[PDB]
């Protein structure tokens, strides 16, 4: 009846978007954790670099 095919298609696409959103809402925190663990590793590398750089410049001071 055209109105029913239009509404039935809107029903079908809306259910697909709802299920896609549930996937997006679950994969996104995993991405936050991965971003948090990456910057944690970068900061740990960065302070270890100053300890080695200044520790190397303390030894040239001899």
């Amino acid at each position: 009846s055209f109105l029913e095919n239009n509404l039935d298609q809107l029903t079908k696409v809306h259910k697909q978007l709802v299920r896609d959103n549930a996937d997006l809402r679950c994969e996104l925190p995993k991405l936050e954790k991965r971003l948090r663990c990456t910057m944690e590793r970068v900061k740990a590398l960065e302070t270890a670099l100053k300890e080695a750089k200044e520790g190397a410049m303390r030894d040239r001071k001899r």
């Binding site: 509404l7 809306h14 996104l28 971003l35 970068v42 670099l49 750089k53 190397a56």
Partner: protein, 67 residues
Amino acid sequence: SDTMMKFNIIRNELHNIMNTQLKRAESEVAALNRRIQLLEEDLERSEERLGSATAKLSEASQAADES
């Protein structure tokens, strides 16, 4: 190679990682999180309309038989 040259090489590349990819990644995850929630809100406003249009079409289907 030289030791102090090695440290500054690592510092420079580590600077490029923080200042480009890591910096962009933080503001992108913030936008992505907000866009996902806004889309869901739009979907949640959408369902109420689809629910009302579904009731309106069925009432018209039953009224098309009585006329």
